[PDB]
Design a protein around this ligand. Structure first.
Ligand SMILES: *O[P@@](=O)(OCC(C)(C)[C@@H](O)C(=O)NCCC(=O)NCCS)OP(=O)(O)OC[C@H]1O[C@@H](n2cnc3c(N)ncnc32)[C@H](O)[C@@H]1OP(=O)(O)O
Ligand code: NA
Ligand SMILES: [Zn+2]
Ligand SMILES: [Zn+2]
Ligand SMILES: [Zn+2]
Ligand SMILES: [Zn+2]
Length: 531
């Protein structure tokens, strides 16, 4: 296996030592925390024959200092990787309550805030050793990539490099200030996802809302509908033979499901922070589902900036949804406020460890607060929970309850035929909402075939494979970076162009500077370029 990198950056021992050992010194100065670490662990002094069967590679301050003094480190990452082995040996062998487990953690905390700046003016991203959170003994490591001119290794996630975006390879940031080069534009951006009138309504709505507070840290939000597709919900086999063979409810119900996500600009790059799947039952769907929308799933990662605006924006999105479908012609909407099972994530592959999953009452209350200003903003006229609504309308048949795909009710009914039930309704009153917003329906928006977001399973699965975690701000940015590459490139629709006056087909064409999607034939107010 041969090596080439003609003008590599090589660090001479004194360069490395002179820069890196200010950091080792900070660790030695921690008294008493550092004293079990100034020496290699001696299992016969400590009475733990355990150790070398458990820790297959001991490491300690003294060893790292001698490696540093003799020059056994060629690249700084080897120095960094050795102390993390020292910490990792500590955190492993010892119980999470040990004294030296803690000592270590204080040492880890100081090495974290010392190594990052040093490694940065050595031209590197951080001085951290990163590994992906466990899946179903081993962890997978964060990827690295090497600058095409430096040869110096950096965290793929730290510098957000992706070959599909920049196919000429990765080149570092100061080798571009010396190249005179600025980095080519990332054209695979959340904003540049295909725009739709639904998506525009919600981003246009929250955007000046955020200006309504004008907090300095706020950045742009892009809302995009990334998948849209006509589906049919089959009536499940219990109610199957008892209501449709009779002919009182339909065999299937046609709906249009959409998946839609919201992104914010953080540190200059798209971060995805909200996702939702809806079911829209139009005006030719027969009773009981006619003119009804339903929120299958909703999920969130909390890194929205600033956090004192976070939830407000979730609401304005939801508010904007009912505002949008009201006008298109929908009349009632239906929420099942059920908080995530397990450590089961609804949409996003791996939530932050310290993001709290609400108690159902908290989420119920949340949805009630959300609804209260839809009423007040003159948007919906009111809303009840399912019983102050079911028997206000005096429902008595099992066939009158809206019948949605994957909803609770189709399956409680499903094997209540197998074996009473108005009681199983009334226990779960506050988890199911019914929203009154108020001539056929028209979805102006086209259909977006994008299998990845055709239901929540495709996206979760692919992130698990590819370690697109939403665990931290930095991992969030990286899996947004790649989520968007998947949406842009391997979506299932490719585009025929039309010229807005001529009805006609175009390939050669002129496009407006500012119009949302406006081309016109060579065969007007706007500045146009030839595309
Ligand atoms: O930040 P929120 O407005 O998030 C609302 C969401 C519904 C988007 C969110 O909860 C989410 O990501 N849900 C994922 C799955 C889901 O909701 N599925 C249902 C689809 S119908 O508000 P939260 O409700 O998340 O919490 C706000 C504050 O309350 C604290 N908190 C949440 N959960 C808690 C539990 N179990 N115990 C104690 N406190 C809990 C959070 O820390 C939040 O407080 P801050 O001061 O903002 O940190
Ligand atoms: Na342990
Ligand atoms: Zn890094
Ligand atoms: Zn470089
Ligand atoms: Zn024309
Ligand atoms: Zn025009």
């Amino acid at each position: 296996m041969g090596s080439s990198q003609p003008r590599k950056k090589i660090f001479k021992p004194e360069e490395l030592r002179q820069a890196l050992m200010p950091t080792l010194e900070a660790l030695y100065r921690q008294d008493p925390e550092s004293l079990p670490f100034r020496q290699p662990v001696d299992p016969q002094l400590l009475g733990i024959p355990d150790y070398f069967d458990i820790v297959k590679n001991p490491m300690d301050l003294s060893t790292i200092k001698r490696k540093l003094d003799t020059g056994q480190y060629q690249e700084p990452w080897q120095y960094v990787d050795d102390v993390w082995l020292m910490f990792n040996n500590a955190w492993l062998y010892n119980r999470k309550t040990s004294r030296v487990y803690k000592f270590c953690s204080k040492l880890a905390e100081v090495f974290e805030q010392e190594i990052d700046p040093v490694m940065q003016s050595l031209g590197y991203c951080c001085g951290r050793k990163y590994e992906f959170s466990p899946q179903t003994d081993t962890l997978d490591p964060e990827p690295f990539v090497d600058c095409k001119e430096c040869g110096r290794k950096m965290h793929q996630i730290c510098v957000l490099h992706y070959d599909i975006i920049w196919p000429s390879g990765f080149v570092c940031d100061n080798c571009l200030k010396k190249t005179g080069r600025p980095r080519k534009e990332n054209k695979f951006s959340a904003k540049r996802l295909q725009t739709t009138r639904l998506g525009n309504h919600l981003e246009d709505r929250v955007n000046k809302f955020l200006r309504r507070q004008n907090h300095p840290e706020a950045g742009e939000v892009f809302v995009r509908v990334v998948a849209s597709s006509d589906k049919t919900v089959e009536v499940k086999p219990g109610m199957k033979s008892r209501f449709v063979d009779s002919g009182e409810m339909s065999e299937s119900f046609p709906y249009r499901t959409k998946a839609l996500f919201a992104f914010e600009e953080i540190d200059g790059v798209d971060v995805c922070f909200f996702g939702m799947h809806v079911q829209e039952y139009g005006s030719d769907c027969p009773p009981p589902n006619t003119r009804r929308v339903y929120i299958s799933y909703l999920d969130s990662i909390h890194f929205f900036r600033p956090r004192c605006l976070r939830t407000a924006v979730y609401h304005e999105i939801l508010i904007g949804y009912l505002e949008y479908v009201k006008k298109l012609g929908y009349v009632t909407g239906h929420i099942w406020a059920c908080p995530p099972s397990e450590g089961d994530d609804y949409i996003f592959h791996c939530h932050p460890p310290d993001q709290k999953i609400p108690k159902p009452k908290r989420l119920q209350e949340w949805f009630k607060k959300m609804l209260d200003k839809a009423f007040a903003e003159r948007i919906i006229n009111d809303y009840k929970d399912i019983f102050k609504q079911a028997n206000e309308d005096r429902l008595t048949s099992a066939k009158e309850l809206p019948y949605f795909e994957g909803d609770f009710w189709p399956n409680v009914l499903e094997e209540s035929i197998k074996e009473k039930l108005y009681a199983t309704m009334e226990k779960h009153k506050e988890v199911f909402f019914v929203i009154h917003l108020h001539p056929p329906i028209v979805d102006p928006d086209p259909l977006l075939s994008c299998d990845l977001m055709d239901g929540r399973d495709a996206f979760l699965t692919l992130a698990r494979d590819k370690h697109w975690e939403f665990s931290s701000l930095r991992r969030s940015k990286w899996s947004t970076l790649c989520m968007l590459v998947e949406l842009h490139t391997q979506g299932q629709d490719r585009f025929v162009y039309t010229c807005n006056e001529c009805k006609h087909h175009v390939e050669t064409r002129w496009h407006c500077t500012v119009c949302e999607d406006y081309d016109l034939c060579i065969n007007h107010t706007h500045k146009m370029v030839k595309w």
